[PDB]
């Protein structure tokens, strides 16, 4: 099984196992699962680009042992 | 009384698209509180469009007291930590917020007076944190966020009567009769619902 990496800005790392076809929805929901953080307050970044939701890690060429960013998205309410 | 009651019911008309020119609504209190607030008690204090992310940036200004900080300085800040271009950091901010490391980033660009963080951490810390430097400070960032919060910025301001002033930018929880609250950002803190370790606190 494939693992991604998932580092925040103040420089804490977590290890994903994910797959190619999992829709980067599909990651957010990992993400809350390991570190809480509710799927609409998450930004992931992979080379300078902001992911979306809809598409996969496939549609990013983004490959095992790649690396993320992880952003929290703090509008207003 | 009244003005300040419209100008909130305007910042909730999105019928015009979000922009880099309207994505600042009006002002509770439009001129300067680098320090003390005016004659009526109030700071500096913007209001935002409710459709808008941009809360990071107003409650930046209330912490300074005045108009310093705009779309430029959080794009750059950005640009230079993810790698985002910088034009179109500029459309994701006004979408999709800032994060509490590009606040950090945009506060100590300023130099002079010293801005101390803590980025991801309990309220329970961070509370006995403000309690501990309560006196030698006079104005706090709170970032909001994880399980039970939308995701949020808040401003607090000591005036004179070292009273705390909770500034919200928010267009919703400002109430025409009593703007800016008085409430510690210490007890503001304790109060949150959530229970992880997802706030932060940039004082000086």
């Known amino acids: 099984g494939m693992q991604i990496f998932v ?22 929901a990992k993400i809350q699962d390991k570190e809480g953080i509710p799927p609409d307050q998450q930004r992931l970044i992979f080379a300078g680009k902001q ?7 496939s549609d990013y060429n983004i490959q095992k042992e790649s690396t993320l960013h992880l952003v929290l998205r703090l509008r207003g309410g | 009384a009244s003005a300040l009651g419209n100008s909130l019911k305007k910042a909730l008309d999105t019928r015009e698209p979000l922009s ?6 009006g002002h509770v209190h439009p001129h300067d509180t680098p320090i003390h607030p ?22 930046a200004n209330a912490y300074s007291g005045s108009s310093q900080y705009n779309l430029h300085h959080f794009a750059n800040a950005q640009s ?3 790698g985002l271009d910088y034009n179109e950091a500029k459309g994701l901010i006004l ?7 590009f606040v950090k980033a945009v506060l100590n660009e300023s130099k002079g007076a010293a801005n101390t963080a803590h980025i991801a951490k309990s309220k329970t810390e961070l509370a006995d944190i403000l309690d501990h430097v309560d006196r030698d400070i006079d104005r706090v960032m709170v970032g909001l966020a994880g399980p039970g919060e939308s995701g949020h910025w808040v401003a607090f301001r000591k005036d004179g009567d070292k009273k705390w002033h ?3 930018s928010y267009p919703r929880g400002i109430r025409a009769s009593d703007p800016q609250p008085d409430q510690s950002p210490a007890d503001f803190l304790r109060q949150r619902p959530g229970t992880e370790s997802h706030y932060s606190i940039i004082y000086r």
């Open chain 1, 7 to 28: 580092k925040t800005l103040t420089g804490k790392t977590i290890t994903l196992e994910v797959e190619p076809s999992d829709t980067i929805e599909n990651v957010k």
């Open chain 2, 166 to 168: 909770k500034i919200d």
């Open chain 2, 20 to 25: 880099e020119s309207n994505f600042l609504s």
């Open chain 2, 95 to 101: 979408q999709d917020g800032n994060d509490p490391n």
């Open chain 2, 80 to 82: 230079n930590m993810v």
């Open chain 1, 51 to 57: 992911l979306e939701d809809g598409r996969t890690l």
């Open chain 2, 38 to 59: 005016g004659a009526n008690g109030l700071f500096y204090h913007e209001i935002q469009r409710v459709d808008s992310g941009t809360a990071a940036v107003h409650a």
